UniProtKB/Swiss-Prot annotation:
This is E3 ubiquitin-protein ligase RING2. E3 ubiquitin-protein ligase that mediates monoubiquitination of 'Lys-119' of histone H2A (H2AK119Ub), thereby playing a central role in histone code and gene regulation. H2AK119Ub gives a specific tag for epigenetic transcriptional repression and participates in X chromosome inactivation of female mammals. May be involved in the initiation of both imprinted and random X inactivation. Changing Y21A: Reduced interaction with CBX7. It is linked to Luo-Schoch-Yamamoto syndrome: An autosomal dominant disorder characterized by intrauterine growth retardation, severe intellectual disability, behavioral problems, early-onset seizures, feeding difficulties, and dysmorphic features. White matter abnormalities and delayed myelination are observed on brain imaging. The hPRC-H complex purification reported probably presents a mixture of different PRC1-like complexes. It comes from the Eukaryota. Monoubiquitinated, by auto-ubiquitination. Polyubiquitinated in the presence of UBE2D3 (in vitro). Component of chromatin-associated Polycomb (PcG) complexes. Component of a number of PRC1-like complexes; these complexes contain either the polycomb group ring finger protein PCGF1, or PCGF2, or PCGF3, or PCGF4, or PCGF5, or PCGF6. Part of a complex that contains RNF2, UB2D3 and BMI1; within that complex RNF2 and BMI1 form a tight heterodimer, where UB2D3 interacts only with RNF2. The complex composed of RNF2, UB2D3 and BMI1 binds nucleosomes, and has activity only with nucleosomal histone H2A. Part of a complex that contains PCGF5, RNF2 and UBE2D3. The gene is RNF2. There is a cross-link at K23, K85 (Glycyl lysine isopeptide (Lys-Gly) (interchain with G-Cter in SUMO2)). It comes from Homo sapiens. It is found in: Nucleus; Cytoplasm; Chromosome.
Length: 92
């Protein structure tokens, strides 16, 4: 299962540039994603590549659910995001 994601800095937990659009496998884990992100941010906002990030998913009621790092993206999508839109993911 291919998964599209849009990543944004958590709007209150990060100090107020980019939106990042990613397509990947539903088999990738949330942890893999946070490690990928640590590598991206170390270079793109320049070890810092070792820094850890928490991943949140936007909820319909305007909240943010922390995603367990062991969950596959396919499981994330089943649990929290069934809809036909890229997953709206936030990091801090
Ligand atoms: Cl945007």
């Amino acid at each position: 299962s291919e998964i599209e994601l849009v990543f944004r800095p958590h709007p209150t937990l990060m100090e107020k540039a980019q939106t990042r659009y990613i397509k990947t496998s539903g088999n990738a884990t949330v942890d893999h994603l946070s490690k990928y992100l640590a590598v991206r941010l170390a270079l793109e906002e320049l070890t810092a590549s070792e820094k850890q990030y928490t991943i949140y998913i936007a909820t319909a009621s305007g909240q943010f659910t922390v995603l367990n790092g062991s969950f596959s993206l396919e499981l994330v999508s089943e649990k929290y995001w069934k809809v036909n839109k890229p997953m709206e993911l936030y990091y801090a």
